[PDB]
Ligand binder design. Structure first.
Ligand SMILES: Cc1cc2cn[nH]c2cc1-c1cccc2c(N)c(C(N)=O)nnc12
Length: 271
């Protein structure tokens, strides 16, 4: 206990159980903390992350807590193959979950997934905290089918320039508003735009946005004012909500509070 701050977990308290998946920072495993408590263990790949900057930020992140936000439990920082310890989400990433056709989702379930994400985002917005890479790949699903937002703010610590350059091979072009693509203008309203694309992913059962276009073509399409169109499973009212997130003028896009109200209105009207 001596060597440890309140944000610090002793890796010796971890039992490793199975691999859950991978991503920009490498592998995530399911484990137990002190033999009893389910955790996910993000095993940060050497050289992938600005670790000292992240660790400072982790202290701020420890204080972010909302039922629809994947909880940060702590960090293992005395090693430099460092670990991030988070809430365990048994059903994995939302993108893979949507793509499993066996679920045979009702549209009521799809709207609930949108509301789960919108609640987390309204909370982050109230803390003036940008996600910066909102997308289905960064949402997770627990054993109860509840969707939670994960990896919020972590793009700030990615060392791979292919991910951080707007013309990089790995930049999230398809989730970005014109002002991000054109002049790197990030704001609450770029999270709003990404949330609209996320609603589109959900109602499309995990199709890739602009699936027939390259990133370069997508950037041209959207800068010209053209947009994604209505997924078959989206009602007119649902489509109106997602489309509102894509106003060319950022200041004409809603807040997450307004989106949440609109989503609840639709739940009352079409459930
Ligand atoms: C969501 C995610 C992000 C990153 C970034 N680097 N490596 C990553 C791995 C994942 C990821 C993929 C698939 C499943 C999970 C998962 N079940 C959990 C979890 N907390 O249970 N966390 N991350 C996952």
């Amino acid at each position: 206990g001596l060597g440890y701050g309140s944000w610090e977990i002793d890796p010796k308290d971890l039992t490793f159980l199975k691999e859950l998946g991978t991503g920009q920072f490498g592998v995530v495993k399911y484990g137990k903390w002190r033999g009893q408590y389910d955790v996910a263990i993000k095993m940060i790949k050497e050289g992938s992350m600005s670790e000292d900057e992240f660790i400072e930020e982790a202290k701020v992140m420890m204080n972010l807590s909302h039922e629809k936000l994947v909880q940060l439990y702590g960090v293992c920082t005395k090693q430099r193959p460092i670990f991030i310890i988070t809430e365990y989400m048994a059903n994995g990433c939302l993108l893979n979950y949507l793509r499993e056709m066996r679920h045979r989702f009702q549209t009521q379930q799809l709207l609930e997934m949108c509301k789960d994400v919108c609640e987390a985002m309204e909370y982050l917005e109230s803390k003036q905290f940008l996600h910066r890479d909102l997308a289905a790949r960064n949402c997770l699903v627990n054993d109860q089918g509840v969707v939670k937002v994960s990896d919020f703010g972590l793009s700030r610590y990615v060392l791979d320039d292919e991910y951080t350059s707007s013309v990089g091979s790995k930049f999230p072009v398809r989730w970005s508003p014109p002002e991000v693509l054109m002049y790197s203008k990030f704001s609450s309203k770029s999270d709003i735009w990404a949330f609209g694309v996320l609603m589109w992913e959900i109602y499309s059962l995990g199709k890739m946005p602009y699936e027939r276009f390259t990133n370069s073509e997508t950037a041209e399409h959207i800068a010209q004012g053209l947009r994604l169109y209505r997924p078959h499973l989206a009602s007119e009212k649902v489509y109106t909500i997602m489309y509102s997130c894509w106003h060319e003028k950022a200041d004409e896009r809603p807040t997450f509070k307004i989106l949440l109200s609109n989503i609840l209105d639709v739940m009352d009207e079409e459930s």
